[PDB]
Amino acid sequence: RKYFVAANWKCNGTLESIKSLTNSFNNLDFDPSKLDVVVFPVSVHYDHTRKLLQSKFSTGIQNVSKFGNGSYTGEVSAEIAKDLNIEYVIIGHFERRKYFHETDEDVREKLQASLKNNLKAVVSFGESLEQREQNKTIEVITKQVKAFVDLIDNFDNVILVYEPLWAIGTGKTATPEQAQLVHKEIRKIVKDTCGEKQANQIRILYGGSVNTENCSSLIQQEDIDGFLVGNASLKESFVDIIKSAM
Amino acid sequence: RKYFVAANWKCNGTLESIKSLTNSFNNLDFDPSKLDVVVFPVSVHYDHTRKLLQSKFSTGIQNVSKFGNGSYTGEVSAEIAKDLNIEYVIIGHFERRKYFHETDEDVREKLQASLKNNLKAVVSFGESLEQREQNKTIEVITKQVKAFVDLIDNFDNVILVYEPLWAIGTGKTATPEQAQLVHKEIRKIVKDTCGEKQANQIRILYGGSVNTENCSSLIQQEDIDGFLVGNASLKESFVDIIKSAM
């Protein structure tokens, strides 16, 4: 599997900060055929970021509409993203599930829209503290993955992200060993539903807290293929995280 | 009051279609010191649209985050908008209240964030058919307005929009006089919640179906200060709608 390192800038950035950050990113000499590196700026920063980043960097947006073009004030359609050659989309990030009540069905429909418009999708899922403490990790993850997994038409073009919500804002820390086991089980779900070659092909990323210290311990695990990186990706030292995949 | 003609493009456009449309828009010679004309493209179209439109046309975004900068994947903060010189935001459009379950509280928090970052806000509200048929027009609008109205300090920088949901996809048609009667009640509400001078200052737009055939009859009404325009704003004849306010 080709490693996949992704920068989720979330709701952060100014024109000036992006200028300096992209410049430092550009200094890193990597081969985009040997690893995928994707930057996800804020929607209104996309053009600024795409222009400043060298071509070796892939780019995407942090959310896409479940509706097509039409009367949906505030939404960005997959059709619009296609027209702009926005390569990737993030779907089902826990923050959107949390703050904006995005459901499993929303995730399914957003993937449909994305694939129909030749967009590549980074799809997030994961269980809460309550769910894991009640021993429902597999039940929850199976349910979330099965909400969309049957739609994947190309297993290079859809990338999965495990988000250990149980270890986010709770005071708990997900170890690389724990993450690996979940990733292993995610791959098995893909095997059972899509096929063995498909399961062996698909990138499954760790989408918990990733920094320059823990990235190697995580990516070296057999079933962890990279990261969707939060606040560490807003730093110039993000290049060292990319280096763990090189 | 300075009249206010706005284009809500909703989820529509290609780079080509915007190029052609902005060009036709630029042919209209109006004085921006006497009339406000604002275009609201899709977020990812904003840069393209702003660069193509002559500066006599003000620009904004169709939605803004209720949160500040931080871990809010997919959102655009008021601070990011301010940094990009995004002048206007639409808040509480019925499509966001309907499809994405945005509440009065969301509208309030979006307005607080916007004003804190010196953005100008176009704020929508309005009653459904069921509510009008129950003779609850005033009751509903009073509640929706009072949700956010106390946040307004500068009454040139907040623009109200009446959306007659009772006449949207229902088979019913709002007459300009029926629109006027609601606009006058809205201004009365502002008067009693904020003061007389403030009510006379604030712009109140009609945000129902506006086209070239009805724009003049609407703008002639004493308490209708302009329009938030849907489908008709995607056409080159939108210049004729602007002309009705010149």
PDB file of all heavy atoms in Angstrom, chain A residues 9 14-30 39 48-54 56-57 233-239 242, unseen atoms left out:
ATOM      1  N   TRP A   9      -6.223  21.073   8.048  1.00  0.00           N
ATOM      2  CA  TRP A   9      -6.017  22.379   8.670  1.00  0.00           C
ATOM      3  C   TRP A   9      -7.230  22.848   9.467  1.00  0.00           C
ATOM      4  O   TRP A   9      -7.147  23.824  10.215  1.00  0.00           O
ATOM      5  CB  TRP A   9      -5.633  23.432   7.624  1.00  0.00           C
ATOM      6  CG  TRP A   9      -4.224  23.306   7.104  1.00  0.00           C
ATOM      7  CD1 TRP A   9      -3.231  22.501   7.592  1.00  0.00           C
ATOM      8  CD2 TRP A   9      -3.644  24.041   6.018  1.00  0.00           C
ATOM      9  NE1 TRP A   9      -2.078  22.673   6.865  1.00  0.00           N
ATOM     10  CE2 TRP A   9      -2.300  23.617   5.896  1.00  0.00           C
ATOM     11  CE3 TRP A   9      -4.128  25.011   5.130  1.00  0.00           C
ATOM     12  CZ2 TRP A   9      -1.437  24.127   4.919  1.00  0.00           C
ATOM     13  CZ3 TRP A   9      -3.265  25.522   4.158  1.00  0.00           C
ATOM     14  CH2 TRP A   9      -1.937  25.077   4.064  1.00  0.00           C
ATOM     15  N   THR A  14      -4.660  32.061   7.730  1.00  0.00           N
ATOM     16  CA  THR A  14      -4.778  33.388   7.140  1.00  0.00           C
ATOM     17  C   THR A  14      -4.007  33.321   5.832  1.00  0.00           C
ATOM     18  O   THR A  14      -3.241  32.381   5.619  1.00  0.00           O
ATOM     19  CB  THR A  14      -4.130  34.472   8.018  1.00  0.00           C
ATOM     20  OG1 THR A  14      -2.747  34.155   8.219  1.00  0.00           O
ATOM     21  CG2 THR A  14      -4.830  34.595   9.368  1.00  0.00           C
ATOM     22  N   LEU A  15      -4.186  34.316   4.966  1.00  0.00           N
ATOM     23  CA  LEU A  15      -3.418  34.384   3.724  1.00  0.00           C
ATOM     24  C   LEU A  15      -1.913  34.365   4.008  1.00  0.00           C
ATOM     25  O   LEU A  15      -1.151  33.664   3.340  1.00  0.00           O
ATOM     26  CB  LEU A  15      -3.794  35.628   2.908  1.00  0.00           C
ATOM     27  CG  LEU A  15      -5.202  35.723   2.305  1.00  0.00           C
ATOM     28  CD1 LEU A  15      -5.388  37.064   1.609  1.00  0.00           C
ATOM     29  CD2 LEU A  15      -5.480  34.576   1.338  1.00  0.00           C
ATOM     30  N   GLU A  16      -1.503  35.129   5.018  1.00  0.00           N
ATOM     31  CA  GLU A  16      -0.095  35.261   5.383  1.00  0.00           C
ATOM     32  C   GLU A  16       0.492  33.964   5.948  1.00  0.00           C
ATOM     33  O   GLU A  16       1.606  33.576   5.581  1.00  0.00           O
ATOM     34  CB  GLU A  16       0.085  36.422   6.371  1.00  0.00           C
ATOM     35  CG  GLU A  16       1.534  36.829   6.637  1.00  0.00           C
ATOM     36  CD  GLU A  16       2.194  36.014   7.743  1.00  0.00           C
ATOM     37  OE1 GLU A  16       1.474  35.467   8.610  1.00  0.00           O
ATOM     38  OE2 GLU A  16       3.439  35.929   7.747  1.00  0.00           O
ATOM     39  N   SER A  17      -0.252  33.303   6.836  1.00  0.00           N
ATOM     40  CA  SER A  17       0.242  32.089   7.493  1.00  0.00           C
ATOM     41  C   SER A  17       0.357  30.939   6.502  1.00  0.00           C
ATOM     42  O   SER A  17       1.298  30.149   6.570  1.00  0.00           O
ATOM     43  CB  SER A  17      -0.634  31.691   8.689  1.00  0.00           C
ATOM     44  OG  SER A  17      -1.849  31.091   8.270  1.00  0.00           O
ATOM     45  N   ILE A  18      -0.605  30.861   5.582  1.00  0.00           N
ATOM     46  CA  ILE A  18      -0.597  29.847   4.527  1.00  0.00           C
ATOM     47  C   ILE A  18       0.580  30.067   3.573  1.00  0.00           C
ATOM     48  O   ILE A  18       1.212  29.109   3.132  1.00  0.00           O
ATOM     49  CB  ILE A  18      -1.957  29.791   3.780  1.00  0.00           C
ATOM     50  CG1 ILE A  18      -3.029  29.199   4.702  1.00  0.00           C
ATOM     51  CG2 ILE A  18      -1.855  28.977   2.488  1.00  0.00           C
ATOM     52  CD1 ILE A  18      -4.452  29.467   4.258  1.00  0.00           C
ATOM     53  N   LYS A  19       0.880  31.331   3.277  1.00  0.00           N
ATOM     54  CA  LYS A  19       2.040  31.675   2.452  1.00  0.00           C
ATOM     55  C   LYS A  19       3.334  31.110   3.048  1.00  0.00           C
ATOM     56  O   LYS A  19       4.102  30.437   2.352  1.00  0.00           O
ATOM     57  CB  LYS A  19       2.150  33.195   2.266  1.00  0.00           C
ATOM     58  CG  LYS A  19       3.162  33.618   1.206  1.00  0.00           C
ATOM     59  CD  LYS A  19       3.459  35.107   1.280  1.00  0.00           C
ATOM     60  N   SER A  20       3.559  31.369   4.336  1.00  0.00           N
ATOM     61  CA  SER A  20       4.772  30.907   5.008  1.00  0.00           C
ATOM     62  C   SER A  20       4.804  29.387   5.170  1.00  0.00           C
ATOM     63  O   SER A  20       5.854  28.767   4.989  1.00  0.00           O
ATOM     64  CB  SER A  20       4.952  31.601   6.365  1.00  0.00           C
ATOM     65  OG  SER A  20       3.943  31.215   7.280  1.00  0.00           O
ATOM     66  N   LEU A  21       3.652  28.793   5.487  1.00  0.00           N
ATOM     67  CA  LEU A  21       3.565  27.348   5.728  1.00  0.00           C
ATOM     68  C   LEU A  21       3.784  26.531   4.455  1.00  0.00           C
ATOM     69  O   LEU A  21       4.566  25.576   4.459  1.00  0.00           O
ATOM     70  CB  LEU A  21       2.228  26.977   6.388  1.00  0.00           C
ATOM     71  CG  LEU A  21       2.068  25.566   6.967  1.00  0.00           C
ATOM     72  CD1 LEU A  21       3.078  25.295   8.074  1.00  0.00           C
ATOM     73  CD2 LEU A  21       0.658  25.366   7.490  1.00  0.00           C
ATOM     74  N   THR A  22       3.096  26.907   3.378  1.00  0.00           N
ATOM     75  CA  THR A  22       3.250  26.236   2.085  1.00  0.00           C
ATOM     76  C   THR A  22       4.691  26.331   1.583  1.00  0.00           C
ATOM     77  O   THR A  22       5.220  25.369   1.026  1.00  0.00           O
ATOM     78  CB  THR A  22       2.279  26.781   1.006  1.00  0.00           C
ATOM     79  OG1 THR A  22       2.424  28.201   0.894  1.00  0.00           O
ATOM     80  CG2 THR A  22       0.831  26.448   1.358  1.00  0.00           C
ATOM     81  N   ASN A  23       5.320  27.486   1.798  1.00  0.00           N
ATOM     82  CA  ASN A  23       6.732  27.664   1.458  1.00  0.00           C
ATOM     83  C   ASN A  23       7.636  26.638   2.145  1.00  0.00           C
ATOM     84  O   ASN A  23       8.494  26.038   1.493  1.00  0.00           O
ATOM     85  CB  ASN A  23       7.201  29.089   1.764  1.00  0.00           C
ATOM     86  CG  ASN A  23       8.638  29.336   1.331  1.00  0.00           C
ATOM     87  OD1 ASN A  23       9.002  29.109   0.172  1.00  0.00           O
ATOM     88  ND2 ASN A  23       9.462  29.800   2.262  1.00  0.00           N
ATOM     89  N   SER A  24       7.430  26.426   3.446  1.00  0.00           N
ATOM     90  CA  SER A  24       8.216  25.439   4.197  1.00  0.00           C
ATOM     91  C   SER A  24       7.921  24.010   3.736  1.00  0.00           C
ATOM     92  O   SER A  24       8.828  23.178   3.652  1.00  0.00           O
ATOM     93  CB  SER A  24       8.016  25.593   5.713  1.00  0.00           C
ATOM     94  OG  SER A  24       6.752  25.107   6.134  1.00  0.00           O
ATOM     95  N   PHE A  25       6.656  23.737   3.424  1.00  0.00           N
ATOM     96  CA  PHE A  25       6.237  22.443   2.881  1.00  0.00           C
ATOM     97  C   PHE A  25       6.936  22.168   1.550  1.00  0.00           C
ATOM     98  O   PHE A  25       7.413  21.056   1.310  1.00  0.00           O
ATOM     99  CB  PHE A  25       4.716  22.410   2.681  1.00  0.00           C
ATOM    100  CG  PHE A  25       3.916  22.218   3.953  1.00  0.00           C
ATOM    101  CD1 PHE A  25       4.505  22.339   5.213  1.00  0.00           C
ATOM    102  CD2 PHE A  25       2.552  21.952   3.881  1.00  0.00           C
ATOM    103  CE1 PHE A  25       3.750  22.171   6.373  1.00  0.00           C
ATOM    104  CE2 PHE A  25       1.787  21.787   5.036  1.00  0.00           C
ATOM    105  CZ  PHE A  25       2.387  21.897   6.283  1.00  0.00           C
ATOM    106  N   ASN A  26       6.997  23.194   0.698  1.00  0.00           N
ATOM    107  CA  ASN A  26       7.644  23.111  -0.616  1.00  0.00           C
ATOM    108  C   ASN A  26       9.127  22.748  -0.555  1.00  0.00           C
ATOM    109  O   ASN A  26       9.672  22.176  -1.504  1.00  0.00           O
ATOM    110  CB  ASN A  26       7.456  24.421  -1.392  1.00  0.00           C
ATOM    111  CG  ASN A  26       6.037  24.598  -1.918  1.00  0.00           C
ATOM    112  OD1 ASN A  26       5.242  23.657  -1.933  1.00  0.00           O
ATOM    113  ND2 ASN A  26       5.721  25.809  -2.362  1.00  0.00           N
ATOM    114  N   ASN A  27       9.772  23.080   0.562  1.00  0.00           N
ATOM    115  CA  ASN A  27      11.188  22.773   0.766  1.00  0.00           C
ATOM    116  C   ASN A  27      11.490  21.279   0.878  1.00  0.00           C
ATOM    117  O   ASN A  27      12.626  20.855   0.657  1.00  0.00           O
ATOM    118  CB  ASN A  27      11.733  23.523   1.987  1.00  0.00           C
ATOM    119  CG  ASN A  27      11.954  25.005   1.713  1.00  0.00           C
ATOM    120  OD1 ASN A  27      11.939  25.823   2.633  1.00  0.00           O
ATOM    121  ND2 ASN A  27      12.166  25.354   0.450  1.00  0.00           N
ATOM    122  N   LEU A  28      10.473  20.486   1.211  1.00  0.00           N
ATOM    123  CA  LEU A  28      10.635  19.042   1.341  1.00  0.00           C
ATOM    124  C   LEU A  28      10.610  18.350  -0.015  1.00  0.00           C
ATOM    125  O   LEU A  28       9.623  18.432  -0.747  1.00  0.00           O
ATOM    126  CB  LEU A  28       9.562  18.446   2.261  1.00  0.00           C
ATOM    127  CG  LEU A  28       9.566  16.923   2.446  1.00  0.00           C
ATOM    128  CD1 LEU A  28      10.758  16.459   3.280  1.00  0.00           C
ATOM    129  CD2 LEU A  28       8.264  16.474   3.076  1.00  0.00           C
ATOM    130  N   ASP A  29      11.702  17.662  -0.333  1.00  0.00           N
ATOM    131  CA  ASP A  29      11.816  16.908  -1.574  1.00  0.00           C
ATOM    132  C   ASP A  29      11.294  15.483  -1.383  1.00  0.00           C
ATOM    133  O   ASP A  29      11.991  14.622  -0.841  1.00  0.00           O
ATOM    134  CB  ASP A  29      13.273  16.895  -2.054  1.00  0.00           C
ATOM    135  CG  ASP A  29      13.438  16.282  -3.439  1.00  0.00           C
ATOM    136  OD1 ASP A  29      12.437  16.128  -4.167  1.00  0.00           O
ATOM    137  OD2 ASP A  29      14.586  15.958  -3.804  1.00  0.00           O
ATOM    138  N   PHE A  30      10.057  15.250  -1.817  1.00  0.00           N
ATOM    139  CA  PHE A  30       9.475  13.908  -1.802  1.00  0.00           C
ATOM    140  C   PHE A  30       8.939  13.521  -3.179  1.00  0.00           C
ATOM    141  O   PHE A  30       8.669  14.386  -4.016  1.00  0.00           O
ATOM    142  CB  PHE A  30       8.390  13.770  -0.716  1.00  0.00           C
ATOM    143  CG  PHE A  30       7.097  14.485  -1.029  1.00  0.00           C
ATOM    144  CD1 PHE A  30       6.062  13.825  -1.691  1.00  0.00           C
ATOM    145  CD2 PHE A  30       6.904  15.807  -0.638  1.00  0.00           C
ATOM    146  CE1 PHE A  30       4.864  14.476  -1.976  1.00  0.00           C
ATOM    147  CE2 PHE A  30       5.706  16.468  -0.917  1.00  0.00           C
ATOM    148  CZ  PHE A  30       4.685  15.800  -1.588  1.00  0.00           C
ATOM    149  N   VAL A  39      -3.149  18.161   1.294  1.00  0.00           N
ATOM    150  CA  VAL A  39      -3.432  19.281   2.177  1.00  0.00           C
ATOM    151  C   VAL A  39      -4.903  19.673   2.039  1.00  0.00           C
ATOM    152  O   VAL A  39      -5.401  19.845   0.929  1.00  0.00           O
ATOM    153  CB  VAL A  39      -2.503  20.481   1.877  1.00  0.00           C
ATOM    154  CG1 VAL A  39      -2.854  21.672   2.751  1.00  0.00           C
ATOM    155  CG2 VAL A  39      -1.037  20.081   2.082  1.00  0.00           C
ATOM    156  N   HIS A  48      -5.884  29.849  -2.966  1.00  0.00           N
ATOM    157  CA  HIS A  48      -4.651  30.402  -2.413  1.00  0.00           C
ATOM    158  C   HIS A  48      -3.638  29.294  -2.116  1.00  0.00           C
ATOM    159  O   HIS A  48      -2.461  29.396  -2.478  1.00  0.00           O
ATOM    160  CB  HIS A  48      -4.978  31.187  -1.140  1.00  0.00           C
ATOM    161  CG  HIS A  48      -3.834  31.992  -0.607  1.00  0.00           C
ATOM    162  ND1 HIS A  48      -3.259  31.742   0.619  1.00  0.00           N
ATOM    163  CD2 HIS A  48      -3.167  33.048  -1.129  1.00  0.00           C
ATOM    164  CE1 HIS A  48      -2.284  32.608   0.830  1.00  0.00           C
ATOM    165  NE2 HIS A  48      -2.205  33.409  -0.217  1.00  0.00           N
ATOM    166  N   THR A  49      -4.119  28.226  -1.482  1.00  0.00           N
ATOM    167  CA  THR A  49      -3.281  27.101  -1.078  1.00  0.00           C
ATOM    168  C   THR A  49      -2.793  26.293  -2.284  1.00  0.00           C
ATOM    169  O   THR A  49      -1.613  25.952  -2.369  1.00  0.00           O
ATOM    170  CB  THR A  49      -4.029  26.195  -0.064  1.00  0.00           C
ATOM    171  OG1 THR A  49      -4.486  26.991   1.038  1.00  0.00           O
ATOM    172  CG2 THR A  49      -3.131  25.092   0.463  1.00  0.00           C
ATOM    173  N   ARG A  50      -3.701  26.008  -3.215  1.00  0.00           N
ATOM    174  CA  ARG A  50      -3.378  25.239  -4.416  1.00  0.00           C
ATOM    175  C   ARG A  50      -2.321  25.937  -5.277  1.00  0.00           C
ATOM    176  O   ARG A  50      -1.405  25.293  -5.795  1.00  0.00           O
ATOM    177  CB  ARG A  50      -4.646  24.960  -5.238  1.00  0.00           C
ATOM    178  CG  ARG A  50      -4.433  24.189  -6.552  1.00  0.00           C
ATOM    179  CD  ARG A  50      -3.954  22.754  -6.325  1.00  0.00           C
ATOM    180  NE  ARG A  50      -2.526  22.684  -6.013  1.00  0.00           N
ATOM    181  CZ  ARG A  50      -1.888  21.588  -5.610  1.00  0.00           C
ATOM    182  NH1 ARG A  50      -2.538  20.437  -5.458  1.00  0.00           N
ATOM    183  NH2 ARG A  50      -0.587  21.641  -5.357  1.00  0.00           N
ATOM    184  N   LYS A  51      -2.455  27.253  -5.419  1.00  0.00           N
ATOM    185  CA  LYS A  51      -1.501  28.048  -6.191  1.00  0.00           C
ATOM    186  C   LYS A  51      -0.107  28.043  -5.559  1.00  0.00           C
ATOM    187  O   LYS A  51       0.897  27.920  -6.263  1.00  0.00           O
ATOM    188  CB  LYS A  51      -2.005  29.482  -6.366  1.00  0.00           C
ATOM    189  CG  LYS A  51      -3.079  29.644  -7.433  1.00  0.00           C
ATOM    190  CD  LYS A  51      -3.208  31.101  -7.862  1.00  0.00           C
ATOM    191  CE  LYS A  51      -4.093  31.255  -9.090  1.00  0.00           C
ATOM    192  NZ  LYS A  51      -5.542  31.252  -8.758  1.00  0.00           N
ATOM    193  N   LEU A  52      -0.055  28.155  -4.233  1.00  0.00           N
ATOM    194  CA  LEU A  52       1.217  28.262  -3.510  1.00  0.00           C
ATOM    195  C   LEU A  52       1.946  26.931  -3.315  1.00  0.00           C
ATOM    196  O   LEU A  52       3.181  26.893  -3.322  1.00  0.00           O
ATOM    197  CB  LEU A  52       1.018  28.957  -2.161  1.00  0.00           C
ATOM    198  CG  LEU A  52       0.646  30.444  -2.203  1.00  0.00           C
ATOM    199  CD1 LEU A  52       0.184  30.902  -0.835  1.00  0.00           C
ATOM    200  CD2 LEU A  52       1.798  31.309  -2.708  1.00  0.00           C
ATOM    201  N   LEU A  53       1.188  25.852  -3.130  1.00  0.00           N
ATOM    202  CA  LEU A  53       1.772  24.517  -3.009  1.00  0.00           C
ATOM    203  C   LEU A  53       2.280  24.014  -4.352  1.00  0.00           C
ATOM    204  O   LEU A  53       1.611  24.169  -5.374  1.00  0.00           O
ATOM    205  CB  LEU A  53       0.757  23.520  -2.444  1.00  0.00           C
ATOM    206  CG  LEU A  53       0.469  23.528  -0.942  1.00  0.00           C
ATOM    207  CD1 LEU A  53      -0.694  22.599  -0.652  1.00  0.00           C
ATOM    208  CD2 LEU A  53       1.693  23.125  -0.125  1.00  0.00           C
ATOM    209  N   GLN A  54       3.463  23.408  -4.341  1.00  0.00           N
ATOM    210  CA  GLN A  54       4.012  22.771  -5.537  1.00  0.00           C
ATOM    211  C   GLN A  54       3.161  21.567  -5.947  1.00  0.00           C
ATOM    212  O   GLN A  54       2.402  21.028  -5.137  1.00  0.00           O
ATOM    213  CB  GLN A  54       5.468  22.360  -5.313  1.00  0.00           C
ATOM    214  CG  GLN A  54       6.444  23.536  -5.264  1.00  0.00           C
ATOM    215  CD  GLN A  54       7.900  23.103  -5.169  1.00  0.00           C
ATOM    216  OE1 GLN A  54       8.781  23.918  -4.901  1.00  0.00           O
ATOM    217  NE2 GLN A  54       8.159  21.820  -5.398  1.00  0.00           N
ATOM    218  N   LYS A  56       3.643  18.481  -6.471  1.00  0.00           N
ATOM    219  CA  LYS A  56       3.825  17.227  -5.727  1.00  0.00           C
ATOM    220  C   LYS A  56       2.765  17.038  -4.635  1.00  0.00           C
ATOM    221  O   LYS A  56       2.412  15.910  -4.292  1.00  0.00           O
ATOM    222  CB  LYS A  56       5.237  17.143  -5.131  1.00  0.00           C
ATOM    223  CG  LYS A  56       5.605  18.289  -4.194  1.00  0.00           C
ATOM    224  CD  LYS A  56       7.084  18.277  -3.852  1.00  0.00           C
ATOM    225  CE  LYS A  56       7.461  19.517  -3.057  1.00  0.00           C
ATOM    226  NZ  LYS A  56       8.935  19.708  -2.976  1.00  0.00           N
ATOM    227  N   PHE A  57       2.264  18.149  -4.100  1.00  0.00           N
ATOM    228  CA  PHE A  57       1.210  18.117  -3.096  1.00  0.00           C
ATOM    229  C   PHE A  57      -0.162  17.960  -3.737  1.00  0.00           C
ATOM    230  O   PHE A  57      -0.509  18.686  -4.674  1.00  0.00           O
ATOM    231  CB  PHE A  57       1.236  19.388  -2.247  1.00  0.00           C
ATOM    232  CG  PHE A  57       2.415  19.475  -1.323  1.00  0.00           C
ATOM    233  CD1 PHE A  57       3.565  20.160  -1.704  1.00  0.00           C
ATOM    234  CD2 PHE A  57       2.379  18.871  -0.071  1.00  0.00           C
ATOM    235  CE1 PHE A  57       4.661  20.244  -0.849  1.00  0.00           C
ATOM    236  CE2 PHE A  57       3.470  18.950   0.789  1.00  0.00           C
ATOM    237  CZ  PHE A  57       4.614  19.637   0.396  1.00  0.00           C
ATOM    238  N   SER A 233      -0.272  19.646  11.758  1.00  0.00           N
ATOM    239  CA  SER A 233      -0.181  19.946  10.327  1.00  0.00           C
ATOM    240  C   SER A 233      -0.209  21.448  10.030  1.00  0.00           C
ATOM    241  O   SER A 233      -0.010  21.864   8.885  1.00  0.00           O
ATOM    242  CB  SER A 233      -1.278  19.216   9.537  1.00  0.00           C
ATOM    243  OG  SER A 233      -2.542  19.850   9.666  1.00  0.00           O
ATOM    244  N   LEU A 234      -0.454  22.247  11.067  1.00  0.00           N
ATOM    245  CA  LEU A 234      -0.407  23.706  10.970  1.00  0.00           C
ATOM    246  C   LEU A 234       1.004  24.242  11.239  1.00  0.00           C
ATOM    247  O   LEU A 234       1.232  25.453  11.200  1.00  0.00           O
ATOM    248  CB  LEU A 234      -1.406  24.342  11.946  1.00  0.00           C
ATOM    249  CG  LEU A 234      -2.884  23.961  11.786  1.00  0.00           C
ATOM    250  CD1 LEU A 234      -3.675  24.292  13.042  1.00  0.00           C
ATOM    251  CD2 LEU A 234      -3.501  24.629  10.560  1.00  0.00           C
ATOM    252  N   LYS A 235       1.938  23.331  11.504  1.00  0.00           N
ATOM    253  CA  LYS A 235       3.320  23.676  11.846  1.00  0.00           C
ATOM    254  C   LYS A 235       4.272  23.324  10.713  1.00  0.00           C
ATOM    255  O   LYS A 235       4.011  22.404   9.940  1.00  0.00           O
ATOM    256  CB  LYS A 235       3.768  22.904  13.087  1.00  0.00           C
ATOM    257  CG  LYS A 235       3.011  23.202  14.360  1.00  0.00           C
ATOM    258  CD  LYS A 235       3.450  22.226  15.430  1.00  0.00           C
ATOM    259  CE  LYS A 235       2.831  22.547  16.771  1.00  0.00           C
ATOM    260  NZ  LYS A 235       3.472  21.728  17.836  1.00  0.00           N
ATOM    261  N   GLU A 236       5.394  24.039  10.643  1.00  0.00           N
ATOM    262  CA  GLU A 236       6.441  23.747   9.660  1.00  0.00           C
ATOM    263  C   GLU A 236       7.045  22.356   9.868  1.00  0.00           C
ATOM    264  O   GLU A 236       7.535  21.736   8.923  1.00  0.00           O
ATOM    265  CB  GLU A 236       7.530  24.827   9.692  1.00  0.00           C
ATOM    266  CG  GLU A 236       7.010  26.215   9.325  1.00  0.00           C
ATOM    267  CD  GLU A 236       8.093  27.277   9.228  1.00  0.00           C
ATOM    268  OE1 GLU A 236       9.238  27.039   9.672  1.00  0.00           O
ATOM    269  OE2 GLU A 236       7.787  28.366   8.705  1.00  0.00           O
ATOM    270  N   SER A 237       6.987  21.871  11.107  1.00  0.00           N
ATOM    271  CA  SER A 237       7.497  20.550  11.471  1.00  0.00           C
ATOM    272  C   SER A 237       6.638  19.394  10.938  1.00  0.00           C
ATOM    273  O   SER A 237       6.971  18.226  11.145  1.00  0.00           O
ATOM    274  CB  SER A 237       7.649  20.442  12.990  1.00  0.00           C
ATOM    275  OG  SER A 237       6.414  20.677  13.644  1.00  0.00           O
ATOM    276  N   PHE A 238       5.545  19.724  10.251  1.00  0.00           N
ATOM    277  CA  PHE A 238       4.717  18.722   9.571  1.00  0.00           C
ATOM    278  C   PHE A 238       5.524  17.918   8.550  1.00  0.00           C
ATOM    279  O   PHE A 238       5.209  16.754   8.278  1.00  0.00           O
ATOM    280  CB  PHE A 238       3.510  19.380   8.892  1.00  0.00           C
ATOM    281  CG  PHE A 238       2.578  18.406   8.213  1.00  0.00           C
ATOM    282  CD1 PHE A 238       1.865  17.466   8.954  1.00  0.00           C
ATOM    283  CD2 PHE A 238       2.410  18.433   6.832  1.00  0.00           C
ATOM    284  CE1 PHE A 238       0.994  16.568   8.326  1.00  0.00           C
ATOM    285  CE2 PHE A 238       1.541  17.538   6.196  1.00  0.00           C
ATOM    286  CZ  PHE A 238       0.837  16.604   6.948  1.00  0.00           C
ATOM    287  N   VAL A 239       6.571  18.533   7.999  1.00  0.00           N
ATOM    288  CA  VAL A 239       7.444  17.849   7.037  1.00  0.00           C
ATOM    289  C   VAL A 239       8.109  16.608   7.646  1.00  0.00           C
ATOM    290  O   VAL A 239       8.406  15.649   6.935  1.00  0.00           O
ATOM    291  CB  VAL A 239       8.503  18.796   6.397  1.00  0.00           C
ATOM    292  CG1 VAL A 239       7.820  19.877   5.567  1.00  0.00           C
ATOM    293  CG2 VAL A 239       9.417  19.412   7.452  1.00  0.00           C
ATOM    294  N   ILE A 242       5.592  13.842   7.439  1.00  0.00           N
ATOM    295  CA  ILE A 242       5.670  13.323   6.068  1.00  0.00           C
ATOM    296  C   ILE A 242       6.883  12.399   5.911  1.00  0.00           C
ATOM    297  O   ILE A 242       6.785  11.344   5.282  1.00  0.00           O
ATOM    298  CB  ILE A 242       5.700  14.451   4.995  1.00  0.00           C
ATOM    299  CG1 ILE A 242       4.441  15.324   5.075  1.00  0.00           C
ATOM    300  CG2 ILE A 242       5.838  13.860   3.592  1.00  0.00           C
ATOM    301  CD1 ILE A 242       4.565  16.659   4.335  1.00  0.00           C
TER     302      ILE A 242
END
